[PDB]
Design a protein around this ligand. Sequence first.
Ligand code: NA
Ligand code: NA
Lengths: 130, 130
Amino acid sequence: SSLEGGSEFSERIGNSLSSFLSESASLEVIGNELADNIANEIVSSLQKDSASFLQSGFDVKTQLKATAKKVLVEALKAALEPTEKIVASTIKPPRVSEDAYFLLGPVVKTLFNKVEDVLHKPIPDTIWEY
Amino acid sequence: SSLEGGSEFSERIGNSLSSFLSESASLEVIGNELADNIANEIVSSLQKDSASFLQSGFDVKTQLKATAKKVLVEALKAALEPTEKIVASTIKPPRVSEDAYFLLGPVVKTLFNKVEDVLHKPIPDTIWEY
Ligand code: NA
Ligand code: NA
């Protein structure tokens, strides 16, 4: 189970991310071409490792790509609320002065509300209610 | 191209993360069951989406999981340095009060160094500079 062009796959990841600084590249564009890299590499490497998969259905291979990419997306969205729960658990009083949370909480709620909108997974603002 | 038990896949993710606070669970453990979640869900969802792949049989499907998991790990390692370079670029003065970076910088270098150690990818702390 070795990857097809693993050394070259690692470079493509760096470039996708490096293009945020080297070019003005939307966070959302990079997310998409990272999933393309990962999904593509999974199909490349499976063709290499399975004679039987190579034998099959270029239809199957485009579907594997589409599925793997969809999974990555849905995985990241699934991680957002538990993450907020973790963050909110760390900054909620007594861990922070409740007067201090009056200021801090809305800052983080706002920060994560940006992520909620970029990832199109809106989450209740009640997590931060206290 | 729908996922197999999408609502239930979202839950396995949360539990993997929620176990960071409860159980005081190892970071290496949580990251691993995350790649197993994703790798497993890719195989599950392709059984659902493609008729022939459901027909392909066990030899191929376990290889897919192995490959998918491997691709995820290598993707993370290739992304860590370019990611640090992005984070550092974003929070380095003037972007932040340089007195504020004095407090903030060492927190995130340590934060990222936790990840460096788990994945056996050390990166110079020089990236956080002045
Ligand atoms: Na929200
Ligand atoms: Na380091």
